[PDB]
Ligand binder design. Structure first.
Ligand SMILES: CCCC[C@H](NC(=O)[C@H](C)NC(=O)[C@H](CCC(=O)O)NC(=O)[C@H](Cc1ccccc1)NC[C@H](CC(C)C)NC(=O)[C@@H](NC(=O)[C@@H](N)CCCNC(N)=[NH2+])C(C)C)C(N)=O
Lengths: 99, 99
């Protein structure tokens, strides 16, 4: 897929058997998903963004399918206004920005 | 160019008469620049992201050259942690997201 940017780049993902919508974000180092139950151990972390810092639960080596492509890596879960797929996962599906 | 996502995608931009380094942010609807005295009128605006909102000043019709690509649109100036080139300007340089 060659995704143009006139609209927000929304993609369907499947995490924990659950389908959700997420924004492919090249300005995010990591991947933060809204509060949900995820099987596994998780370590408490803090990340920051434009408005400041938020507390998240950190899950390692989670299997996640982004637009059909699979990836296995870290997923942070917490109070984000929107689900974001960061660079840690976008590199796994071989996404690049072009112009 | 084709930008890979192993590292933050940073490019040099030109606003007003100065050179800067900005991050191409596919998950930013808007463009927000670090604090700087740009001549011209503006309106107060509130912008949010992860963690909350920040107050910014809004300038319209500003010309920015990004990666040797001139565009023109609204720029928001405020105490942002990084210069962020959003979709309002990315669509003007014809940038796509491909995986
Ligand atoms: C391996 C870990 C690395 C270290 C780790 N990294 C970070 O914290 C880095 C700097 N932060 C990030 O990468 C975070 C996302 C979270 C994350 O990836 O962890 N990135 C971000 O927050 C980037 C911008 C940025 C980049 C780098 C630094 C700071 C800021 N923006 C992400 C964000 C996504 C959006 C859909 C909410 N976009 C925005 O914030 C833009 N906002 C918008 O476009 C709004 N119009 C959206 C709606 C707002 N309102 C609402 N939802 N009710 C803004 C630039 C105008 C850490 N914790 O220190």
């Amino acid at each position: 897929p060659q995704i143009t940017l006139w609209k927000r780049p929304l993609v369907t993902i499947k995490i924990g058997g659950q389908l959700k919508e997420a924004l492919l974000d090249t300005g995010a180092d990591d991947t933060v998903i809204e509060e949900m139950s995820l099987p596994g151990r998780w370590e408490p972390k803090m990340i920051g963004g434009i408005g400041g810092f938020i507390k998240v639960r950190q899950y390692d080596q989670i299997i996640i399918e982004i637009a059909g492509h699979k990836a296995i890596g870290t997923v942070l879960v917490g109070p984000t206004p929107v689900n974001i797929i960061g660079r840690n996962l976008l590199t796994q599906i071989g996404a690049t920005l072009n112009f």
